[PDB]
């Protein structure tokens, strides 16, 4: 259900493998490819509710470093129109005095199509 | 700097290893111990700003399953009074109609002491 | 531009008056009608960016009291397909020990249609 | 309980009047003084839980305009060490393409002292 390629409304793509142990591993997109890691409920309830998950990307790679990281929190909904609904937080490293403006909040939805 | 044991203001403890590759691995606390995974800026700026990081915990283990997950986003600040400042999002798996009440937001600070 | 009736994707409706002073006043929907109050940028930039605003609703009225309140933060975008894009926080009054689970985060978009 | 002067951990001050109707009116601090408006639970539960409230400030005044607004969501806790605990969202007006980076999230605590 979760393993495979997902597309965000804006162009971004993520490729992920969901292990039997509750692990998420993959990449977020060559100068713009980045490593991701996360966890998920490997035994969800059967009564129709979604499957909880989360993952992180640090924005550094062989070609650039933005000195920041994003975390996504949300749930997988199965079916014909499968989707992953998230909210995210983006934190940048800052000095002592600019800490208050260090974190962005947003949201996103991913589909298979 | 980041490897080691951290304590949250409320009692929670987390033990983490920061790899050379930008990886975070460890545990969050036996019936209450859980696996965590994340990423961090392995080459931060030198001008005094903090080090960006994030991690995820799925709330399932050999003893219980709360059908949910938490993600933490924030930064490490070094020195004599080292600390990690975060904001977090907690998502539970829900039905279609209760999705709107699915996600909590909060914050936390961790110290070495 | 902002004065008038707005509809949320789920059925909710809000009626608002934007004063010359930067004030927002109106109602959010008879047992389910509630008073709202807010503020907005009464002199936005001309270069195409949106108009910042925010408002609050306390969930008490002559017929019920849910001991909570929601605040919306976002921006107005003008044109043929005018819209207001927000993120919101919902806080409930809690005891000392359950404070950590006191606040929900979500998002919403409103249209004229 | 709520009427009066409150001080944030960083220097900011806010002066507010809580009406019998569930209204909040006041100012947030002369070139740096701004109008605020909000709402609160005028009949909270008696079992010890806090009193839910929210307010908004638009960052424009006779001396400057930052084309943005902040909303605060949280609760009042009474007693000898009275306090107001909040989380806030700050939205700036942006173009179509920079919308994703438009909103900051943070937190704050206010005291009487």
Three-class HEC string of A56-76: EEEEECCCCEEEEEEEEEEEE
Phi/psi of residue A103, nearest 5 degrees: -130, 120
**Is D39:C25 a contact under the CB 8 Å cutoff?**
no
* Nearest by Cα to B91 from D105, A96, A40: A40
**Rounded to whole angstroms, how far apart are CA atoms C63 and A110?**
40
**Is D67:D98 a contact under the CB 8 Å cutoff?**
no
Question: What does D14-78 look like in DSSP terms, one character per residue?
Answer: EEEEE-TTSEEEEEE--TT-EEEEEEE-SS--SSS--EEEEEEEEEE-SS-EEEEEEEEEEEEE-
Residues of A in contact with C105 (CB under 8 A): 87, 105
**Is A103:D104 a contact under the CB 8 Å cutoff?**
yes
Strand A51-60 and strand A65-77: the pairing is antiparallel
Which resolution in angstroms does this entry have? 2.2
Give how far A78 is from chain C: nearest CA, Å: 21
**Rounded to whole angstroms, how far apart are CA atoms A59 and B99?**
30
**Rounded to whole angstroms, how far apart are CA atoms A99 and B82?**
15
Cα dihedral sign, A34-D92-C93-D85: positive
Here the tokens at position B1 are 């700097």
- A-interface mutation test, from D9, D73, D104, D107, most A Cβ less than 10 A away: D104
Burial (Cβ within 10 Å: 0-12, 13-18, ≥19) of residue B69? buried
Give how far D25 is from chain C: nearest CA, Å: 10
Helix and strand numbers, DSSP H then E, in chain A: 0, 8
**Rounded to whole angstroms, how far apart are CA atoms B94 and B103?**
10
Domain span at residue B23 reads: 1-113
- A-interface mutation test, from B91, B94, B96, B97, most A Cβ less than 10 A away: B91
**Rounded to whole angstroms, how far apart are CA atoms C39 and D26?**
13
Domains of chain A: total: 1
- Nearest CB neighbour to C89, from listed D40, D43, D73: D73
**Is B95:B67 a contact under the CB 8 Å cutoff?**
no
> Inter-chain contact B37–A37, Cβ cutoff 8 Å?
yes
- Cα-based angle C45, D101, A100 (whole degrees, multiple of 5): 95
Cα dihedral sign, B22-B7-A105-A81: positive
* Nearest by Cα to C53 from C31, C36, C69, C32: C36
Domain of C95, CATH number, reads 2.40.128.30
Question: What does D86-98 look like in DSSP terms, one character per residue?
Answer: EEEEEEE---TTS
DSSP annotation of C93: -
């Amino acid at each position: 259900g979760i393993t495979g390629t997902w597309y965000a409304q804006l162009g971004s793509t993520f490729i992920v493998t969901a292990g039997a142990d509750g692990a998420l591993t993959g990449t977020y997109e060559a100068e713009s490819r980045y490593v991701l890691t996360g966890r998920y409920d490997s035994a969800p309830a059967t009564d129709g509710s979604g499957t909880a998950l989360g993952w992180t990307v640090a924005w550094k790679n062989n070609y650039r470093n933005a000195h920041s990281a994003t975390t996504w929190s949300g749930q997988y909904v199965g079916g014909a129109e499968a989707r992953i609904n998230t909210q995210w937080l983006l934190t940048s490293g800052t000095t002592e005095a600019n800490a208050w403006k260090s974190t962005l909040v947003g949201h996103d939805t991913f589909t298979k199509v």
